[PDB]
Structure 1
Amino acid sequence: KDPLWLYKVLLTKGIEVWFDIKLEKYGIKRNNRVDYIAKSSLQQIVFEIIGKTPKNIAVPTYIGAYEPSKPEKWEEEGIKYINLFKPTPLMKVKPVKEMPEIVKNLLLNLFDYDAKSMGLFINWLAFIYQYKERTGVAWIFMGKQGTGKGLLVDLLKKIFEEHMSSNITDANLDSQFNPYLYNKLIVHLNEVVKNRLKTWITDETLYINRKNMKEVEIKNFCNFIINSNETIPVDIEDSDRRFNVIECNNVLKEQEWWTTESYQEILNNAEGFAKYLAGIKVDRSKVNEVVMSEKKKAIVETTESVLKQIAKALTDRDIEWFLDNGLEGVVEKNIVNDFQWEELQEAITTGVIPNKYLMIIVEQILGDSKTITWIKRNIITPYQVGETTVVKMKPIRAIVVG
């Protein structure tokens, strides 16, 4: 008669049930809680609610989708959708112009009373809180322990609730399942997958596999915060566009304002901090902004290969890089004359290096004797420094940069 009678009677009781062809499960949405259950589970629910087990579930057929920018239901290309994003209490919160003070001292302690980066991080957080999109930039908090990184992720975890992943470590990565990425606005990882993570930052779609559900490709809303107590947590390239790095070495127990209860006082102020974020006026040009802090510049120049730097010093004829790396030791160990010591650095700046001097340079930077064949296949050829050639210096075989 009416194939949606049960759907309507449960809506009166504030309960919205549909069938999700995509997962072959029934969706039930209660009081800011969306569950996916099998039919036999849903039949047990409606018997408790309406006193009878219908043999046929008279409910509509929607496609579940987690999109926080869209209505409770919408449709596109004829297929009708129902939304799986339901905000937690502390996202539906009245704005505030200024944040609770003990929360303000926690972040100031984290950012070392630097306003530009702390304000840039809060602008990033506020954007996630208000606009609920993927930013494509992640924040790495590192340094020492007891600095507040663990608290700020428990502070945000009370704000974002089910939409945040807390302390995902290699134990969950080794799992065949992906639950920490399914319908999340923030994903926290503890300690750090060099490319597995760098991809998640800018992916729109991930394959979500979770236990007793179909493996499904959903759109990606994850923003990553990464805590690490190692000196070099990840390999970062010099052209990077994904990572902001903040090193904090101020321990919270050693500060003026800290008590034992401050950990739970800061946590019991989650409402105030959420109300602050709700009131930030976001600058959308600076959510995907990364800055090259000298801690990040430190991570990059320890990470990038030394053979790459030799090749690029060779390319830019940067004699000053070689002498910063101790090339002048070649003369005090009398490997080279004072006459030949000026021919050798002439060869670097000139971009025409005889095989004789090519080995002298590489062996003094690297600290072991390398052959010309090795130098070409590990420094010259892969980084395209130049061509090995006969040059009229007598016929000297040299490499000409270019």
Structure 2
Amino acid sequence: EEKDPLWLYKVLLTKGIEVWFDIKLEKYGIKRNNRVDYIAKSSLQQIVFEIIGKTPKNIAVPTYIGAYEPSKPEKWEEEGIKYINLFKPTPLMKVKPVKEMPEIVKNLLLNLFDYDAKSMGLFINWLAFIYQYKERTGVAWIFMGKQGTGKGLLVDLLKKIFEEHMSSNITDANLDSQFNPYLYNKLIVHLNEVSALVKNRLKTWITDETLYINRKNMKEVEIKNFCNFIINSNETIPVDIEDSDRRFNVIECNNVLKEQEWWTTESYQEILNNAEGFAKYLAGIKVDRSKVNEVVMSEKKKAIVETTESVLKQIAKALTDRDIEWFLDNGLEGVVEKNIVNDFQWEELQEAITTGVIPNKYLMIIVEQILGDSKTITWIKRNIITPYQVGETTVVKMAGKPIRAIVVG
């Protein structure tokens, strides 16, 4: 009966509206003035009526799959499936390259990294890559330290720049919510640790190819992941950081802005008015692609790790490394002061750690002394030697007598 299956599509394109049926979401999509919405059929029929004066029974539009592919065009076709793009660049994403960064913006950035070019520049190279290439980095930045260091200002600054493609000030509460639209179509995702660790999920988000997106009144849907994560915190460790970590750059900043020379009142606002300037700068970076996903052992990251990691691990590692110095650094020499051991035995005890051959009665003496109360061989085995594979419990003949000892290796 119908002559054209897409007449309505075209007539609405004539008027600068692009309508489609999104087979994946079973929802009609609509695109005007770089704003994308998804609406049910009735809602579309109501829009169509207003624009052509006829409510057709049949919505004569193409079936596409909406997909947030920033690099890809307005539309494409992989294999045989027609896709349509949900990424539309914001104003300050489409802006002309420059080589100079606005000076008052630069002072913020300098202030924030405590004037350390290495890490600061690395963050610009990250931020640039996100801006320019619009992919997932596989690294995240934690900014901790006291308030008013312009962590929050950096967020507003960028928020102005990425507009909708960024989520701001996402909290633990938002995560406990069953929905999670703060990851739908987001190049940047900012989090605010607040209570003075449920964000460990984020670890996987940084590197996962895809996310599940539960949105209200929409189908749970799996999507390609373009997220990059910043986390603001104020002296509280938001995430359990492994010693050997490759995801997190950590940047302590305690340079309050209101304690600097350069800070006027109009500074706060001035910074934000230079968003375009800072966009322009970012657009003109020449991106080292190998440095994007680089992480560094900042002073703060080290402090976080050496407090997060288990003391029993640290003992075991000192036993393994045959590292007397550590034990002395942690006050083993106090064994001699309290006359738990004599001058002779103390030589034997140090010898034992270094040689990596430790008599039971010295092991117990060491672990009692480091930890502050006495632990049995059994405990020390089950909670140090055994889980961290320090070595084996065995016999060795020391002097003539056969001695129960732990043999490192």
The TM tier, using the shorter chain, reads over 0.9
- Aligned match of 1:395 in 367, 378, 402? 402
Deviations 1:313-361 (A, max 9, x none): 1011001111111111001111111111011111111111111011001
- Contact 2:96/2:280 (8 A) holds in 1: yes
Distance 2:51 2:268 in 1: 43
- Residues matched between the structures, number: 402
Distance 2:199 2:52 in 1: 53
Distance 1:110 1:204 in 2: 31
Deviations 1:20-45 (A, max 9, x none): 11111001011111100000000111
Task: Please state how far the C-alpha of 1:234 moved relative to its aligned partner.
Answer: 2.8
Q: 1:295 to 1:368 in 2, by over 3 A?
A: same
2:158 matched to 1:156?
yes
Task: Please state how far the C-alpha of 1:233 moved relative to its aligned partner.
Answer: 3.5
- Contact 2:172/2:199 (8 A) holds in 1: no
Deviations 1:294-314 (A, max 9, x none): 111111111111000101110
Distance 1:255 1:379 in 2: 49
- Contact 2:241/2:305 (8 A) holds in 1: yes
Partner of 1:173: 175
Task: Please state how far the C-alpha of 1:194 moved relative to its aligned partner.
Answer: 5.0
- Contact 2:199/2:238 (8 A) holds in 1: no
- Contact 2:200/2:240 (8 A) holds in 1: no
Task: Please state how far the C-alpha of 1:174 moved relative to its aligned partner.
Answer: 1.1
Distance 1:296 1:151 in 2: 23
Q: After the TM superposition, which segments of 4 or more aligned residues of structure 1 sit over 4 Å from their partners?
A: none
- Contact 2:137/2:293 (8 A) holds in 1: yes
- Contact 2:101/2:281 (8 A) holds in 1: yes
Distance 1:63 1:342 in 2: 75
Deviations 1:276-309 (A, max 9, x none): 1011111101000101111111111111110001
Distance 2:310 2:237 in 1: 14
Structure 2 residue ranges without an equivalent (≥5): none
Partner of 1:212: 217
Q: Structure 1 stretch 233-242 or stretch 179-188: which is displaced more?
A: 233-242
Distance 2:290 2:67 in 1: 28
- Contact 1:191/1:230 (8 A) holds in 2: no
Distance 1:231 1:295 in 2: 12
Task: Please state how far the C-alpha of 1:123 moved relative to its aligned partner.
Answer: 0.7
Distance 2:258 2:122 in 1: 26
Distance 1:3 1:194 in 2: 48
Task: Please state how far the C-alpha of 1:112 moved relative to its aligned partner.
Answer: 1.3
Deviations 1:126-162 (A, max 9, x none): 0000000000101111111111000000000001011
Deviations 1:99-127 (A, max 9, x none): 11111111111111111111111111000
Deviations 1:43-85 (A, max 9, x none): 1111111111111100000011101011111111211111110
Deviations 1:154-203 (A, max 9, x none): 00000101100000011101100011011100000001725301111111
- Contact 2:12/2:18 (8 A) holds in 1: yes
Deviations 1:212-252 (A, max 9, x none): 00001101111001110024333212211011111111111
- Contact 1:100/1:269 (8 A) holds in 2: yes
Distance 1:347 1:233 in 2: 40
Distance 1:27 1:368 in 2: 67
Q: State the TM-score, normalized to the length of structure 2.
A: 0.97
Distance 1:358 1:103 in 2: 57
Structure 1 residue ranges without an equivalent (≥5): none
Distance 1:25 1:131 in 2: 30
- Contact 2:385/2:391 (8 A) holds in 1: yes
Taking only the aligned residue pairs, the percentage that are identical comes to: 100
Q: Structure 1 stretch 277-286 or stretch 258-267: which is displaced more?
A: 258-267
Q: 1:400 to 1:194 in 2, by over 3 A?
A: farther
RMSD of aligned alpha carbons? 1.0
Distance 2:368 2:199 in 1: 31
- Aligned match of 1:312 in 311, 317, 326? 317
- Contact 2:200/2:239 (8 A) holds in 1: no
Provide the secondary structure at the position in 2 that maps to 1:201.
helix
Distance 1:294 1:142 in 2: 12
Partner of 1:372: 377
Q: Structure 1 stretch 102-111 or stretch 224-233: which is displaced more?
A: 224-233
Q: Structure 1 stretch 163-172 or stretch 73-82: which is displaced more?
A: 73-82
